[PDB]
Ligand binder design. Sequence first.
Ligand SMILES: [Zn+2]
Ligand SMILES: [Zn+2]
Lengths: 35, 117, 401, 39, 68, 53
Amino acid sequence: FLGWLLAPGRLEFYEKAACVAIALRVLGIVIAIST
Amino acid sequence: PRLAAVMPDAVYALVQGTHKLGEYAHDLVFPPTPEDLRKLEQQVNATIPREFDRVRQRYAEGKIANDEQLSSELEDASFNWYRRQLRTSVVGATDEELEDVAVRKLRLEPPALQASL
Amino acid sequence: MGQFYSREFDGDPYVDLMRSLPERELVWWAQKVIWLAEGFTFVDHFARTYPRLLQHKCQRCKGAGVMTCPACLGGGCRVCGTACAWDAESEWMERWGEWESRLAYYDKATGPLMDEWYEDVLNAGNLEEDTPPVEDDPPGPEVTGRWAEHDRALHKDKKRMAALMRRWGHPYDADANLGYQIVDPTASMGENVWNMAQVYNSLPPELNPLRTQHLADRGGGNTQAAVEAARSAFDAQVVMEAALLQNLEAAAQDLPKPHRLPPTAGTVACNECGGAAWGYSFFPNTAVMFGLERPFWGDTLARLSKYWNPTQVADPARTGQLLPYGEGGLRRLLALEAVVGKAPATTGRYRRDLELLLAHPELRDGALRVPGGWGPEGGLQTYLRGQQEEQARMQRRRDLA
Amino acid sequence: YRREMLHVASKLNFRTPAREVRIDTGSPDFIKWDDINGI
Amino acid sequence: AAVAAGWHLASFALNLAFWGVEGMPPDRYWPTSPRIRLQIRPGRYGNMDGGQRVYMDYLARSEGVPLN
Amino acid sequence: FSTITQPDTDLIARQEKGTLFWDIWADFLVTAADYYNEQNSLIENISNDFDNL
Ligand SMILES: [Zn+2]
Ligand SMILES: [Zn+2]
């Protein structure tokens, strides 16, 4: 189960999703303090 | 980023933190020894190779470093120990010729049992 | 990116609020795609996990699909299978040689040094020479000593390097090894394949048809046929390796193996099933669902212990049988096996070679590295024949003058 | 934060005219049910 | 095999002899629209103004009118 | 039938965050407005209620 869950393709998807997530969080707070 | 690097660091940090908390749990319940700290002092001192004792004396008499000159002093000690161990691996030790290397890596000799007791 | 403006998003209390903030719209899009990824994961987990409930196994072979031929466990048996391609022990190092040759091409373990050697011989215009070493000189000839011969052979290396470079150029140009920078492990396997399938880089030269497409004549007719007949066996062996590895992966867990291969030289096919050892059934296989598959070690111990210990309840007193079971009992009852014991009969084909290894102790030094094998056409005998024929040849060359 | 409440204020009358009223019973201006008569 | 197929064939013939709803009266525990019986009605969100447009052609997709 | 026509993640998220955005914040907003009492007006509103709150 874990060998299927943490496969390289799923790993790269997790990483890209988390990157865009942290990006949008910090960008939203940047534009929210900019109000 | 790069979960493949994060997971080993995550588990390493977990177990090392647990080790620290266990050390704290053991130093408060059972307070530290006052003088056997010298026992462990000298018994971690004894296994320091000879190529480092040259700075140990240099560590005693003032002229150690500022903080940076030692951190480039013990580097070459590490490296000469490294190459010495490489030569002990390949060409053997100082009192040991190729026949004895073949003896040791073929596991031909048993540990001395008569001399044990 | 303001996609909720055009005409037809009016009437939604939250969408019109998203009209006023682009960040809300963008995080909405991110969440929308992430939820779909999550759904795909849920479904494909379900679809690879549910089929394991419906798998049932033939109970007579226990999912093996194949039973034993006892006639062979003790010109031979004719019921039990066709011997495999590797039962021929006298063909082992030959096949291994062919395979390691083919594997030498693909190899990129020494990629960086080969690359910078190609970059050194490539331009030969850099020449940022540092400080040359304090050069030694060899002990001159007429001093016969193994150390001296080592030194002289060590000093004779640069001219021989140029000589072999003349005879065999850089392997990157003879295309004997994989190309200069076809792959490096830091790009994308997506890119690395495309580069691999550009021009027959997935094969070594000896099978590549580009090398042979120019000459095919009346003489043999094998130059374009007997290389296609080798490419075919190559791909067949590669596919067999893939299949065997899929079976090993299914047996690493306790799953039933997906590829049902034909019997072999010691086994016959199960009669109860067809040799198909399992299948799907629409009935849930309660033993897998309730986790009762494996048989609790003590039970198997009891079974095997009562199967290997039969009992004789009748006694030869009344029944007039004093001989044990079997046939030819009267003839059944008619050297140094108690010390050294048996002689192993699987390895006579090396006896000769060992004898040679005793007649020439000098062959045991580390300077010699023979390819390997057993027969007269392989390994040690090749070096012996070369040595003897060359010494006789050039000694007779001395006889001319 | 501020953008959000500003936008929801920009449409405040579009939301609902439903006015919840605060009913008191102890303040003197409150009227009993038996207070109203001739009814 | 013939018997095991004739069973299904008899059942299919019986289902064919029905042919429709002629003879079947109305019923109040079982309306014809699953949405009435199951109490399904849209809310407020997910309401696009030009979604009704789509609605129409979906109807036009199934009412079989090749205009679309 | 009735299971596969429930609202999915998108609509449930819309529902609960819209209900936190519309009927708890905007009603407090209305009480603040008609206690204190066109973009410029919404500014002193967002401010005079930043000041006191
Ligand atoms: Zn047999
Ligand atoms: Zn079977």
